Design a binder for these strands. Structure first.
Lengths: 75, 68, 169, 84, 81, 106, 101, 74, 93, 108
RNA sequence: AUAUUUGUUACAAUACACAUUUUUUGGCACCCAAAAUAGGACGGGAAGAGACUUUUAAAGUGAGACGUCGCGACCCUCGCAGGAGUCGUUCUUGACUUUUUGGUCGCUUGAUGUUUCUCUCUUCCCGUUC
């Protein structure tokens, strides 16, 4: 019905937790009414910052159902 | 450029396996009909997880994927 | 008059004691100056309604006994009660405080009634009782109280608790 | 109705102090307010009662009573309480 | 419904959040929608295991919210007439 | 489901006559024939009490090895024994075989 | 064609079609023909039940249904059977339902 | 702005291969060529293989439900 | 204890202190004020009570005394998704 | 058709509402909402004992059961008795209705 | 001279609408194992010992990590006012603005819950049961 308001967030590098375990960081591109969030230059954060972190793809889309909290690391 | 619903309309009365999301159980059988929600009906199905099953109704929420 | 069920029913259970819990019951027309000469009978009429606090202050009660299983009850105010002995097995796990000021409890009678506990209450006031005057009464009360957090407004001194524990051993 | 206490042990904790106060004042009458809203401590506590008579009695009896080492200076409040 | 309207009435005030994942986000509420998904400003975070951090801005999905703690003085607010 | 008059053929004795002799199967029929009146709803409770049982496609009755049917017909008799019994107020111990047949026959 | 365009009666004809011709026709043909059905729930407990009634959400009324549930701890198994005369079953728990021969 | 399902349509026509993560309970991730999709984000994948979490077996042309979708990643 | 009206719906009861059960095994006790279509409700002065894992072991079948760790949170708004069942504790002021 | 409209006619009957937790509720039934929210009156709600060398029962259902305030201290097994429980609709799994009532009249 | 009843309107309110990621047609379920007899078990508290830890024989009881409110204080700190002010209005109401004691440190083991790994006996005191 109503679109979520991310309007200040887009183009800013953002960390968001996927499910209980996961945390993905990427530059937010677009979003929809289900909160499905597509972002680019995705990286999967882990305990060891440079080591266990591995990039996903040039463009990644996320189902809004697996989104828990969304924090922007940015202005 | 096939979408899901015409893909199920093309898979009617063909042998299709369906993997549920739980035990990695797949029902292998001839599809009969589907609902709007993609409820499934099957004939001569067989449960793989080894058995033979005459007729089957599968609710939409428990299926993982559908293949031919 | 005597503490009946009807009286209990009548009692004002509207104004909750906002310090802790809910439903600060005052049995009869008013528990303060109810004049319950016998022991607190018909406790089942309340039926563990609700640190549930019951004020029995300014009443004739001789013995702190006759309670029904009350899980909620945490506070007993029993001020101006002619308490003599308060031995019971009903209110044991339940209850966090007991105010016994201006009563008739004996120094030996109060000690005898509890029979000792591994853990009990947490707040206790025995002020204006004959027993408190009695020599080594504070040491005897600490030994009887077993575990205790207070003794007549002053906490049993950590060192006093240690010495009392040594006396118990 | 309200009774403004003064000259008490500041070393004791807030909630505990309130509890103690409640325990003290239950003999006179029904204590409406457990502890003073300001909670500055060091004596400053407003014991709100239901009846004025009870309050009066309290004032009479507990004037210079030993509570946590020091003698409590009981006195009637200037302004009426927010609850009353 | 009234429960969501009270959340809209709490904008610009410090609120607490319990996500169904077990965490706790306490901080100032900037935005809220009728889907109960809110965004909070200058918020202290408590992980499910107790580790506490601080983040400047957060957006949470309403489906994952469990309870929201709102300043008490909104109790007498006109919604409840 | 028939809106028209027509002659249709079926079989009242589906399994039990095929298993057990002809004298007894009618007797087991009549133990039932009294019973479904007395089993106003408990019929489908007691006939389908064993959910392993299926009705054959050609047949009507619930096909079984006929041991529980001896139990079902004994249960069903007892519902007839009490319902005949309650109207005339007979004790269950006072019920005798000459009375039990009179309940079955009458 | 989406459902919000249709009128009040077109939804009734749609539900009549879906019950008569569709997946749930397996249950419907099972209700009329008095054929016992096997139902697996999410719980993992399977009921052999005759279907008195059913519905869109798949919740259904069954009479004389028998429940079969096994449990194991450290590979020690036991099979337990429970008989209930009347059952109303909420449809979200079910996964597979088969029609016995 | 690039709406997410627009991006998925750019996965359909650009014929780029995608890896897709499922829910954490199932323990497999699918990868293949996304052909077409519905409003519910349930997608048909041509030449799909299921990898447990590289010896996974090839699937086929398979319809995968959107309820179990977590990530769609190139 | 307290007898609720034999026919009383969630609308009939307002300002009663309730006891709310969630899916996670914790309880919110307090005065109900509003509620909604999907049954997410507003409690006034609410305290969440929880059962300790050692306490949970004690609850297993054999007078029991459970130490229930609880924390006070005022004027909350629950979510209908989490709510499991509701019971009445007390009657209004 | 909404089959929940059937439950609306079962009012004032003894019933067991067997929930997703495994918790079972015996009680007298009152008005059932269109979302299948079921409100009962005099209810004894409990948890079954899986025997199986005393395998551990549901850990969440024991806590939720003690936290109703209706579990009495001296109960040996795990049960609680209380008046007026209101149950959300999505929590229900099975409903066992009495044997006496006839379906042919109520299922119309 | 002789408040009740009837009709209409509005509000609040109950019974008839929706299985597709944001609440009600389920991501569902699983760690595993422990009492049987004909003076005896079970719980709680205290003491001793074994095995654990620490120092170079002598010291207490499985170990390592978040918080939670508490026992001390060589510190700070004055001491009586959710409420307060303003304006409208008449003997206490509305509209518009200002914004919680505890601020901290030890704990010579507060006291106490999560989460990983590995493998108790003797003596006294108090309650319950046959």
């Amino acid at each position: 019905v109503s679109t979520p308001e991310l309007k200040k967030y887009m183009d800013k590098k953002i960390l968001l937790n996927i499910n209980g375990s996961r945390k993905v960081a990427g530059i937010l591109r677009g979003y929809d009414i289900f909160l499905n969030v597509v972002l680019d230059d995705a990286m999967e954060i882990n305990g060891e910052d440079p080591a266990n972190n591995h990039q996903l793809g040039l463009q990644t889309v996320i189902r809004g159902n697996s989104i828990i909290s969304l924090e922007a690391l940015d202005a | 450029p096939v979408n899901p619903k015409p893909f199920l309309k093309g898979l009617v009365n063909h042998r299709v396996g369906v993997k549920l999301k739980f035990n990695s159980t797949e029902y292998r059988g001839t599809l009969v009909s589907t609902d709007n929600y993609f409820n499934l009906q099957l004939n001569e199905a067989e449960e793989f997880v080894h058995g033979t099953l005459g007729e089957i109704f599968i609710r939409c929420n428990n299926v993982l994927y559908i293949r031919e | 008059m005597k503490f009946t069920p009807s009286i209990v029913i009548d009692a004002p259970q509207y104004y909750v004691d906002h310090f802790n819990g809910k439903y600060n019951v005052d049995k009869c027309v008013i528990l303060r100056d109810l004049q319950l000469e016998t022991d607190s009978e018909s406790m089942p009429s309340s039926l563990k309604h609700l640190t549930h606090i019951l004020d029995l202050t300014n009443n004739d009660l001789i013995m702190i006994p006759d309670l029904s299983r009350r899980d909620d009850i945490h506070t007993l105010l029993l001020g101006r009660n002619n308490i003599v002995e308060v031995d019971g097995r009903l209110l044991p796990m339940n209850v966090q405080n007991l105010t016994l000021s201006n009563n008739s409890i004996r120094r030996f009678e109060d000690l005898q009634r509890l029979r000792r506990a591994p853990r009990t209450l947490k707040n206790l006031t025995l002020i204006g009782n004959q027993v408190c005057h009695l020599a080594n009464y504070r040491e005897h009360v600490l030994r009887l109280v077993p575990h205790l957090e207070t003794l007549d407004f002053q906490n049993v001194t950590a060192e006093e608790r240690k010495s009392a524990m040594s006396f118990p051993r | 109705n309200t009774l403004y206490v003064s000259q008490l042990n500041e070393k004791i904790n807030m909630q505990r102090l309130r509890v103690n106060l409640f325990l003290l004042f239950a003999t006179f009458g029904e204590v409406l307010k457990v502890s003073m809203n300001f909670k500055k401590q060091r004596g400053q506590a407003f014991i709100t009662m239901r009846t004025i008579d009870q309050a009066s009695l309290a004032q009479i009896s507990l004037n210079g009573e030993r509570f946590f080492g020091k003698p409590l200076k009981v006195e009637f409040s200037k302004s009426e309480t927010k609850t009353l | 419904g009234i429960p969501v309207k009270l959340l809209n009435e709490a904008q610009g005030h410090i609120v607490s959040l319990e996500l169904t994942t077990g965490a706790t986000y306490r901080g100032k509420l900037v935005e809220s929608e009728d889907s109960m998904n809110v965004q909070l400003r200058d918020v202290i975070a408590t992980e499910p295991q107790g580790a506490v951090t601080h983040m400047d801005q957060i957006f949470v999905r309403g489906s994952q919210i469990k309870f929201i703690v709102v300043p008490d003085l909104l109790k007498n607010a006109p919604l409840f007439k | 489901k028939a809106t028209e008059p027509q002659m249709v053929l079926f079989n009242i004795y589906d399994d039990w006559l095929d298993r057990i002799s002809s004298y007894t199967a009618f007797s087991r029929l009549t133990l039932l024939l009294r019973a479904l009146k007395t089993n106003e709803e408990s019929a489908k409770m007691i006939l389908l009490s064993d959910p392993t049982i299926t009705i054959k496609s050609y047949h009507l009755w619930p096909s079984f090895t006929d041991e529980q049917w001896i139990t079902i017909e004994s249960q069903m008799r007892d519902l007839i024994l009490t319902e005949y019994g309650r109207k005339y107020n007979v004790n269950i111990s006072a019920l005798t075989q000459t009375e039990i047949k009179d309940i079955i026959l009458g | 064609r989406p459902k919000h365009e249709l009128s009040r009666a077109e939804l009734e004809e749609l539900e009549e079609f879906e019950f008569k011709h569709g997946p749930m026709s397996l249950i419907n043909d099972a209700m009329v023909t008095r054929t016992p059905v096997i139902i697996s729930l999410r719980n993992n407990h399977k009921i052999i039940a005759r279907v008195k009634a059913f519905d869109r959400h798949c919740n259904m009324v069954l009479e004389n249904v028998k429940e079969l549930w096994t449990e194991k701890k450290g590979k020690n198994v036991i099979n337990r059977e429970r008989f209930i005369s009347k059952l109303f079953l909420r449809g979200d728990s079910v996964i597979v339902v088969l029609k016995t021969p | 702005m690039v709406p997410p399902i627009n991006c998925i349509f750019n996965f359909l026509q650009q014929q780029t291969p995608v890896t897709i993560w499922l829910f954490e309970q199932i323990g497999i991730r699918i990868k293949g060529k996304i052909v077409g999709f519905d409003e519910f984000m349930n997608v048909v994948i041509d030449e799909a293989v299921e990898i447990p979490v590289e010896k996974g077996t090839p699937l086929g042309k398979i319809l995968l439900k959107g309820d179990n979708i977590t990530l769609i990643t190139s | 204890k307290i007898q609720v009206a034999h026919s009383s719906r969630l609308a009939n009861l307002i300002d009663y202190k309730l006891r709310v059960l969630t899916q996670d095994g914790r309880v919110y006790i307090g005065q109900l004020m509003a509620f909604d279509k999907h049954m997410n409700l507003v409690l006034n002065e609410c305290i969440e009570e929880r059962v300790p894992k050692t306490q949970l072991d004690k609850l297993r079948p054999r007078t029991l005394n459970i130490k229930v760790e609880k924390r006070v949170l005022g004027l909350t708004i629950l979510r209908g998704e989490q709510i499991l069942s509701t019971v009445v504790e007390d009657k209004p002021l | 058709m909404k089959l929940v409209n059937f439950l609306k006619k079962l009012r004032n009957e003894q019933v067991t509402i067997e929930l997703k937790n495994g918790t079972t509720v015996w009680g007298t039934l009152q008005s059932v909402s269109p979302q299948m929210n079921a409100i009962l009156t005099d209810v004894k709600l409990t948890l079954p004992q899986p025997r199986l060398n005393k395998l551990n029962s549901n850990g969440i259902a024991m806590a939720s059961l003690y936290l109703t305030g209706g579990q009495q201290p001296t109960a040996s097994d795990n049960i609680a008795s209380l008046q007026y429980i209101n149950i959300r609709g999505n929590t229900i799994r099975q409903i066992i209705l009495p044997d006496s009532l006839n379906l042919d009249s109520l299922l119309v």
